[model samples]
Target: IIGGEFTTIENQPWFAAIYRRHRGGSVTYVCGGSLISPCWVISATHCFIDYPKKEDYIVYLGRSRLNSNTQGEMKFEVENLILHKDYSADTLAHHNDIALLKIRSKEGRCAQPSRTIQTIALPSMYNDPQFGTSCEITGFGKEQSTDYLYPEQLKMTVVKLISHRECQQPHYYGSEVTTKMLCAADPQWKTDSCQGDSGGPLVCSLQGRMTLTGIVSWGRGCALKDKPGVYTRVSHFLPWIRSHTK
Candidate 1:
């Protein structure tokens, strides 16, 4: 994350790391995900548009640092993969970018409860957070747009939600920004989620708990002025999430 600080799993337990297991058997971290339930994770569909095989994905839970297997961190496989029916992988406009992973355990359990691992609560389907509301995002995305600098450990930054009208201005995303998308960024535009941060949570502190509000979807550049990060508004996909998870 550009202009982000180090974070830990204890602080953001539902965060998940998804990796692509290549044809040669090597794996590389691809994007972040949110643990919505013990056996389910939510992410961006574009993250896996190129990797069609479900078995090619590896999921890591309760992990903060990459390339580490200790600290009670666990790995799992995907039982199923589901993308929104309306999403078009080749479309320039990012609509219904959300995706779901049904997790299958190697340890005979989906996810074990602990100080460093738990599911995050989904927002109320009707509770649309007001524009300018405060929120937080965490991921091992990147720090710059012109360079490739990835933080080995987790990183987080505070951002505020941007109004749909402002974000859809001609100079910005234009009408490409749909109702199902959310825009958020640091007031100074120095901090934002970047490449590799796709599918991570755009969490907001609701009444009593941190709620999953959005999923990292798209953007113009990392932390660029007037170029706020775009996300899949989770609330708009509640019915889709339920139809599959239920």
Candidate 2:
């Protein structure tokens, strides 16, 4: 959310906050996620690699502000952690970096939808986002690269899709940009997702609906002049998502 401004939960009802709780009751905001189903949240595999235990993680839904629990925020325990089988941490290529988190209430029931909390629809397996599509990414990520400050409220920025070819050029991510990844950024590098934004959604409007097209994965840095942000192309893994969530 670097260089972005505050946004409302109603505008991004499916956005989720993934938190890691320590032994002393201290909770650290780790990454962002998207509620693709009542029981399933989609995030990046890298978020769980360090905090791998299911018991240490919780999913917060219907959140707008940070630090303080916003209205309508509900927390759920993670029932399962499912990472993409081919994810490679050592590789900057970030191939198959998506993961799914199954959440449950104390009663072991699935989430019930409300105005402040809802599920976003996934794109069709064959759907391909058009180049230069204007989309938005939302998160409570850092305000800038040089500062420790993060947004007190969820923020969003408008970024345009960059073609896979351009992203693979020497000036950008080069060969690190794979078919499984997509790129997006503001032309002037004035806005983009940052560190804490990983695992968040990259939503684009398709046929009058906001479809989940990508998951924030990695980038060279936050909004560098030539380097755009990389994301896990969700359409490429729709089959994988359906199989695992079943």
Candidate 3:
């Protein structure tokens, strides 16, 4: 029940339902991410850090398949791109790989009954976060796609929070694990995410909605035995995220 491709579009429509695009006017790079507010989108810092400038990015919310277009999708021009200053691309210190983009709201669109974009709440780093929790991970990435996303429905995988000791174990990642990151996955099952799922959101349900927990970081080759995926711990960067967006 936890591992498989999304077979029905109507049942699980969010995948193709919400589409985000970059400045190039294309969605070839289909990594997962969450909207923090009306004008804020959270993604991997590496996604836009190397750009010649920050204003070059644009994010589109609410759509489905990249090859196909869903009605009522709106596009926003990027006002600014803020990459984590601590990100060390060379060391893959992607623990701080999170980035926030300021977006300009677009006008009319033909789409959903609600707003064109849905905003997800941010989890606080200041709180004493539950160590073991269940979260939902969604993305257009392949169940097995290494670096490319299939032109298919977004996949939702149920992952559980793992202890730092277990995540720090050399059973999978060797010595590459960083303290700045947290760990989560479905230990009982093989369900997990691949590289293309970076910057995606791990939503935890509290009052019937999901709170953004982790930003997809480096992993040990996507669900390798004993090698659960790693993510930037949202709790550790609450102050920074708070200062940037709502």
Candidate 4:
């Protein structure tokens, strides 16, 4: 994320790293994901458009550093890919840009929790976070728009939720920001989710727990003037998640 700093795994235990493996021994970072359940992960649907095969994707959890190893980190293979049927790549507006990945361990059980690995709680569908609420977005994304400076470690930045009406202004995403989406960023557009950060979680404090509220979806430009980051309103898709996760 723009203006984000390196974070610890304990701070975001549910954070997941999605990788796209190449035939030439190169593994490309696709997007970030959130571990909602032991075997279930939530991410953006757009991240799977290019490489649709489940075998080509691997989920890494509890890893604070991307380029190096951490003993607490663990990896899992995807057993299933569930993309929202309403998601359309052709639409300029990224509607329903959310998906679920069911991962599995070799022993045929769900992921085991550890000091740096755990699942995040989902926000209640009946309780939508109010506008101007402060939340944090974490990922191993690029630090800036130019020159592609990607951080070797996970990073996080705090952003405030902007009202859908304000986000609908011509200067912002306009009509592109729908009810299924939510906007978050500094009023001056100083901090936001950037490239490689899509599919990460926009977590807010709810009842003494960090709750998943949004999924990093899309934006105009990385931290551009008046352009706040748009995210998939997680509350709007509670039924979908509940159906697939169970």
Each candidate structure's count of clashing pairs: 0, 0, 11, 0
lDDT score, candidate 2, position 222:
92
lDDT of each: 0.88, 0.89, 0.62, 0.88
> For model 1, how does the per-residue alpha-carbon lDDT over 153-241 read when each residue is reduced to its tens digit?
89888889999999999887888898889999988898999998999999997886789999999988789888899999999889999
Model 2 weakest 10-residue run by lDDT: 86-95
Q: What's model 4's overall lDDT?
A: 0.88
Rank the models by TM-score, top first.
Answer: 2, 1, 4, 3
| Reference-based TM-score, model 3 | 0.80
**Stretches of model 2 off by over 4 angstroms after superposition:** none
lDDT of 2: 0.89
Who wins the lDDT comparison? 2
Error of 4 at 121 (Å): 0.8
Model 1 backbone overlap count: 0
Q: Model 3, 113-221: lDDT tens per residue?
A: 2343467777655442466787777666656634344645556777887877777777755556666677777776478777566777776775565677777776756
Question: On a 0 to 1 TM-score scale, where does candidate 4 land against the true structure?
Answer: 0.96
Model 2, span 28-87: residue lDDT tens: 898999999899999999989877889999888999977888877888999999988888
Whose lDDT is higher: candidate 2's or candidate 3's? 2
